[PDB]
Amino acid sequence: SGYLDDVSAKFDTGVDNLQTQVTEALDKLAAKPSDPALLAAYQSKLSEYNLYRNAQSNTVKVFKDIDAAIIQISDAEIWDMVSQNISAIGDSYLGVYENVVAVYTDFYQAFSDILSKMGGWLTVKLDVTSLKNDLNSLVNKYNQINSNTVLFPAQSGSGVKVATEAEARQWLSELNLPNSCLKSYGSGYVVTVDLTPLQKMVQDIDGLGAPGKDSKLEMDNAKYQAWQSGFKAQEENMKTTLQTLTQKYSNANSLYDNLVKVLSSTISSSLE
C-alpha cells in the first residue's frame, strides 16, 4: 500500500544481509572452534536472522495494522505506532523466550525443592533410595508433554500446542539445547526441558552400589566427597542452562528493539 512496498522491499535486503553475516560469523568461528566470543557473535546473528525471517513472514498481518494506524506524523510517534502493531512478531519471538525462561525457572525451582531435604537424608550415610526416588519422579514429571514441560511453542492454557519439525528444530538450535529436548506429539513437535543432568544424577547414585537393609547406604568419606562433587556438578549444569537461556532472552530483547528502530526508520523515511 504505497510506501509499504518500499518498507518491505528494503526489508528483504535485510534478511539477505543477515543471512550473509550468519555464514561469515560461522566461518570466523570455524577458524577458532572454541572461541567464546565468536560463538556468541554467530548465535546472536543466527537469532537475529531468525527474527527478521520472522518479521518477513508476517508482513501482511503487520503492514495491515501499521498502515491502518498510520491512517489514524512525528518519529517518536511512528515508533510508538510500530511498537503496538507487531505482536505477531514479538509473541513468536520474545513471548517464546518469555515462556522458555518461566518454564525452566519453575523446572529448576522444583529441583531446588528436592535439594532442600538432603540433610534429612544424611563415614557418612546417605538415603540412596529416598533421594533417587525423588529424582526419578522429577524425571518422569518433566519427561511428559504439558504446560510444565514445554519451552516452545508457548502452551496457551488448555490443550497442547505443537509446531512443525523445522520450527521446533530452529528453536532447538537457537536455545542451544540437545536432541533429547525435541519431542514429537500429534501433528508436529515441541521443545522441552533438558533432563540429562537429573538422569546422570540417578545414574551416579546407582554407581554408588546397592544400599543396606536401611535402603540407605553408608560410605567412607573418600567416595562420599567424590559422589557429592559429581552431584553438585550436575546441579550447576542445570543452573548454567537456566542462566544461558536468560542471557539469550536479554540479547533477544536488544535485537528486537533494533528491529523496531529499523522498521520505524524505513517507515519514517518512506514518507519524506
From Swiss-Prot:
Keywords: Coiled coil, Secreted, Virulence. Induction: Transcriptionally regulated by SicA and InvF. Also regulated by InvE. The keyword Coiled coil applies. Residues 232-259 form a coiled coil. It is found in: Secreted. GO terms for cellular component: extracellular region. The keyword Cell division does not apply. Required for translocation of effector proteins via the type III secretion system SPI-1, which is essential for an efficient bacterial internalization. Probably acts by modulating the secretion of SipA, SipB, and SipC. Belongs to the invasin protein D family. The N-terminal domain is an intra-molecular chaperone that prevents premature oligomerization of the residues on the coiled-coil region that are involved in interactions with the needle and/or itself. The residues in the C-terminal domain probably form oligomeric structures at the tip of the needle that are responsible for the regulation of secretion of other effectors. This is Cell invasion protein SipD.
